[PDB]
């Protein structure tokens, strides 16, 4: 077990838990620094279907604040691969997807969403 009681949240902690069973790997599941009321932030690896069998490096930091769910997670896209402008329009989508996705775990799917959508994402052309 672990020495006294800590109980930082009840669905932020599952969340976060849960989560480690999906990856269960050291290497793509990484916290940098996690707090019991201060916060929590971690940065994890995930690939995707990429558009030709292949695997897309892509770089999702989800960011735990004290408001939140109330508050919408801290995402912050980038990829060794893509652009500068095409990890921003990666983000914007994410975020705009999270507000109806409020007070729910939007760390899991948002990253199932992505995975999937990302060819979709990737093919939206702006005018100008």
Not at 2 to 7: I, K, T
Not at 104 to 123: A, D, F, T
Request: aromatic letters at 6%; one cysteine or more.
């Amino acid at each position: 077990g672990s020495s006294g009681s800590s109980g930082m949240a009840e669905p932020v902690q599952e969340e976060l838990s849960v989560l480690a069973a999906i990856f269960c790997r050291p290497h793509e599941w990484e916290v940098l620094s996690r707090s019991e009321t201060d916060g929590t932030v971690f940065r994890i690896h995930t690939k995707a279907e990429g558009f030709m069998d292949a695997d897309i490096p892509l770089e999702l930091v989800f960011h735990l604040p004290v408001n939140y769910p109330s508050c919408l997670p801290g995402i912050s896209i980038n990829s060794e691969q893509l652009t500068r402008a095409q990890c921003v329009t990666v983000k914007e989508k994410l975020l705009e997807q999270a507000e109806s996705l409020l007070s729910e775990p939007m760390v899991h799917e948002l990253v199932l969403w992505i995975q999937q959508n990302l060819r979709h994402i990737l093919s939206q052309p702006e005018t100008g």
